[model samples]
Target: DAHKVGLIPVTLMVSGNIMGSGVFLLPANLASTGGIAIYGWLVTIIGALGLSMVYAKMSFLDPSPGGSYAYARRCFGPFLGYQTNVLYWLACWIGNIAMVVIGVGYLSYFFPILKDPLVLTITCVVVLWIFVLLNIVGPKMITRVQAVATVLALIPIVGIAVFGWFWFRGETYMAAWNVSGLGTFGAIQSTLNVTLWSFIGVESASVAAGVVKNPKRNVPIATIGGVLIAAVCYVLSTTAIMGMIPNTAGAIVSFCAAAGCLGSLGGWTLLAGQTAKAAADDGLFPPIFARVNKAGTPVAGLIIVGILMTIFQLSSISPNATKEFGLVSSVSVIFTLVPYLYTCAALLLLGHGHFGKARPAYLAVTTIAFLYCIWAVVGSGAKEVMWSFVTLMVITAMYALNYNRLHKNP
Candidate 1:
């Protein structure tokens, strides 16, 4: 039977989820912190890979359908599992909105009309509903489309990162790196908050254990492979973009500017940027987006996420909007980190009980992964660090409400 899913599709999903809108927008965020932001990418890649290893280990030990939800259920029991599910799911869903918004912001490059809020709002809503309707028709189609889009999207980006270097000037690179007042450590620290979010989709496969072709082998390979590929892409792309433009140019250009530089592909990239942005605005998605499709696409979840992105975008319209955008992006680190804690807890639980054959190496990797999560979350910044803990508490309350209704007997 040709029923088996191959590594190609799984890798595509990982790549699609990770490499989406963030790659386009994050450079501006990193540029704010200075060139030391490049080192933040280095540190984030290592930490992200370590965390991926932990999820891979957990998948083998306690294979299940719920991703971190299953892990929270196994390690901490029903309540903690529910809370983890709520917050993690919310973050995942909301993240889609951010992606679409970023896409739209880029679109403003080609379609000057889209710069108008009314036009932008309508465009975003239309795209959001289209994807939502697509979800109902068949999620497999969405996956297929998303896979293709993800691949197509990488072309201009990877090219710039590689070929654009010829246009690079040493002075521009130096200016980007040398923030006169801030020390290297502070700059790197500021950048890590934004860069670490790039690897958020590393564990996409674990969330669908029931559907994977080879549970044991494919899951781990996809998890680790996806992270490695994404890290390389992000580092190379950032380097090229930073090299091509002056520090000032790099600072002003949003993530979508990479496509603008491509003479041939600029128009297409700009359209993609617009579509992605419109899909993220509030007019496009509803409030209950954290739900999952039967095929595990999280269609509804992503729509609701678009709304939040719109709010953030609207807020950025203010005088101090740039700083506000940076603040929200930094806070998003908390959204990414909470799930790491859930995954680590699951790994610990799986190891203690008599599940599969215990691998000591896996245990060591999981421990390192857990520590990386702790460090990354703390390093996100004092303000985000403090508020994330509060967000966790709110998540717990929301979970309790949902659980009492959904699993009353359990």
Candidate 2:
């Protein structure tokens, strides 16, 4: 029982979750947003660090397995906890589809035929399930492999983030800074939701904190350190890639980072199931999802997720890789941020529960962070805002179906 992972695993896993696909895949797409996206990074990084600090504190305040849902449930109540888990799960599997799409998009760089919508859809589902099965077979292997992948994958990514800057051209960067025809602040606001895709996994370290030794001490260090390392990489990497362009080598660098996104497939998958299993185990979800494989994976829920990801892929086909990524990421951001809003509230409420009143610093941070979540929802645009709402209604309906179970069990 004394044997447990330490700072390195928690730190790498959080950074690994944050950096993959978004920073690498986003630069060229963001280049279209112009150099203003660099400034966009400032607000995005600050907001992310604020949320990370709250979550890190949450980890220490309650070193339990439920992550955000536990925080929301403890501070709020059952229904909000139900809502939190559902929203987080939606974001996870949907975001997983985005990662698959981005990976195959890069792989299409080799095959080219994957550019075809049907081919892309089929390959994306297959790739998604392959990782799901990997989760099923060797649950222990997920961490070792994902952690190894994160450490190794960052090499080429950081190489570009660090070294490509020598080639930075002020004229080239400024030229692309606000090409959206939207004014400076307009461009940054529009890109806010997309910027969030880069940091949405901020809760993973706290969620997985149970495995760490002396979690109260280690969790905050790893959680804060993880986001800091990733924040630096994201800004520096995207800034350089914007100016340098890496024409001939662009193809190679992109594929390399896209490969890094795969670690997320293996790494973050556990959380979706982890979230679902806790819900069911606590009677918020169907009991079927609480079942586990030999390795303690929620195998039933993993399969359900694979099915959901496949259904999501076939539902919409986009004209191009970046367009598909942009649209899906927009909605994913909305879903994830809503849960984040719950966490921000959880902090203030939980603080009061402990000390009879929320600390002034905690009060200040959570207020800003809550509004940050509001900003992402609005910035995600009207259609996704509607999409997020309608989906919530659907989850609300599911809650009705389970209402008897929830009340009776309680």
Candidate 3:
């Protein structure tokens, strides 16, 4: 375990990406949906399983890089692939900032100065850049951090899931079950909002499947294993305290949350850069993003993403950490939703050599995944939708602007 742990397991990389900062604030956020949110978790679990299988089947059929982006492009056309890759890339990096915010949120308790708006923003950028640099160093380093973070973080969280159940009184459970006052379907839709982000990283194993190696085995196993781990830990660890129960949550728990979130920021940041390079390799993005240095690492792409991330953080600095998190979470989740829909639709279109393709059971699973994604996007509200559309237009315009060059050599 010490020095040379050659070739990180594929399962670990996927698992690392699948669980991010969303789970840290899951309970508090889910409470907004009421206890009925449990149903949201179930559907999300099934939906994630569907998504996992889609990638799994696709991995065997055409196990390549770009995950959903690859599937969509192959099934549809390059334009869709371009859109999918960029949207996913945007969400991937943008979503990472939330992790930094969360880690600092926990740090603020002990170090207080992070409470200041300016200091918080600067520290966040500093932390974000450090991860970017680490990513440029290469995959093994990122894997090691994520692997340790996953193990150390899971122990404390599972400890909470198993031990915290002692305080899970039935009264409080029901008391928090339906606070939203909406009908069953309505509230569950609300929970979809929280749950989607909780499970946002479901396709990560597939997206970064290129880097993970042994895709046929690693991709499916990781996709399934990661989601199962997330769903169980999420439902148990957080739901146990659905209502208010006052007890020491223990120092170890915060350590777990922060450590996991910090590691998530790094892993996802690497994923973001990888996404662009994959796009560049396909001529979807500018060629600069495809360059690798003597370290045989995508330092150019990492720096590009790192600089873009820097600007995103600067534009998003706010006095209220909660408000900052909400904005980042919503936008990132919205963009993420777009790519999920693309892939679900792609899975249906990608029905070929894969075992489950176009079969009744496969169709049903894809339907569930597709509908769940639609439900999530709609629940994100009209304003979010409109802005997401605008952002789409923005990306579309970029694509239009580069269309000539992208196809010039073709």
Candidate 4:
């Protein structure tokens, strides 16, 4: 069966995955990283490309559905296969919760009513059910919606990255960079985790392997293309926004408000950013979202995320709550990195011996990608390091439970 979708839809999925609502808040997240965060962008881009190469090559070798699950299963056995499946699914839901919360935060603009937890909760629940219903109807509808959203979403981000350049000032960036005196290493370390989040969608093409057309070539190309576009948009737009607003009293708020504040693009960004944030808070996601309809529409998922994000945002009502919010965000990052680690480990195990005439270069590339995944996650810090292990333990236990329930023989 030609489960593979068309190129446009494939591209849309890749873009949708990468352009999660997090991009809006990235500037603040990287605050501690200072101006050096720009440099970190380069590293993130390269690392993403490296990982994408692995997925692309692997898809060709074993073109199957369930993304990393298929690869791990082919290389190892059902045990590891189930492990990858559980972890990826966990990450997806947690991430969706975060995205939905973000959506609610964004929606607060027009509905002002959403400012209340009671109201916000209702809105989020409504959105989640709507999307869920949409998903049940058909996955193709979701993908179509996602494709349209991709274009709608990109308008603001790309516009600012391009035109906002006219407003760029070197001194502003330098000021932001030098404030902490974190030096190069400290600055990079601080932002590495956040920057890494920007590239999370690089695997979308691979994940939908069963649905994408020409899985061998399309998946790899779309994966790489999405990363490249995201890299440019993130680094350039962030730089533009930073230069436009600097680190003044209301820099972030003002920058977002002013960007296309009068135009449709401006309106789109403002609304989308707030709505996405609100969705992230609603418990629909952890802090990284990717809930989608069979078609890949994230409508339902985004709303629930918004509700939870509102709860999290409300904590900001107190000064101390700021730290708590930061901690939550960091925890989200660690949770995301855990799956990457397992994926890398799986790739290494599978890359062992080529079935037939598979090139040595393929093995070499995957090996390096595996190491890079470890390094990036480690850079996420010890707190992330500790909790990620704990998460893995839980996931492993769940897998064991399911296995025992499903079969008499191991």
The top-ranked prediction according to lDDT is 2
lDDT of 3 by residue, 134-221 (tens): 7776565776677777777877778767766765565766766565637775777666667775677777667666666576666767
Comparing 2 and 4 by lDDT, which wins?
2
Q: What digit string (tens of lDDT, one per residue) describes model 1 on residues 309-336?
A: 4564444443222332445554554665
lDDT of each: 0.56, 0.72, 0.70, 0.54
Off by over 4 Å in 2: 1-6, 111-118, 166-187, 190-193, 211-214, 241-252, 315-329, 353-358, 405-410
Please give the lDDT score at residue 309 for candidate 2. Answer: 78
**All candidates in order of lDDT, best leading:** 2, 3, 1, 4
Candidate 2 clashing pairs?
A: 34-176, 34-177, 35-176, 35-177
lDDT of 1: 0.56
Compare candidates 2 and 4 on TM-score and give the better one.
2
Name the 10 consecutive residues with the lowest summed lDDT in model 3. Answer: 1-10
**What lDDT score is found at residue 103 in candidate 2?**
73
How far off is model 4, as Cα RMSD? 8.0
Per-residue lDDT of model 2, residues 1-410, tens digit only: 33345677668778888877676556665655544555678888888898988888887887656678888786556777788888887778777776777777767766556466688878777888877887776455565567777776787768766566665655776655445536775777645746765577788877665456666888788778889988988877766643444428666665666667667887677678777677776656656786776546678888888888788766654442455445555676678777788877877777765553446677777677776777766654677688788878898888767755344552
Error of 2 at 269 (Å): 1.4
- Which candidate has the top score in TM-score? 3
lDDT of 4 by residue, 1-410 (tens): 33335767666666566765557678777654454556677777777777877776666666555466566564454555555544554445344334444465564565354455556555544554444444333244445556665666666777677656766665766655443426776676566667775566466666665556688778778777766776777787777534333446333443333221111111111122222322233212223434443443344544543454445434433332233234444555455444455555555566565543566766666666766677676665566567767766876776545443232554
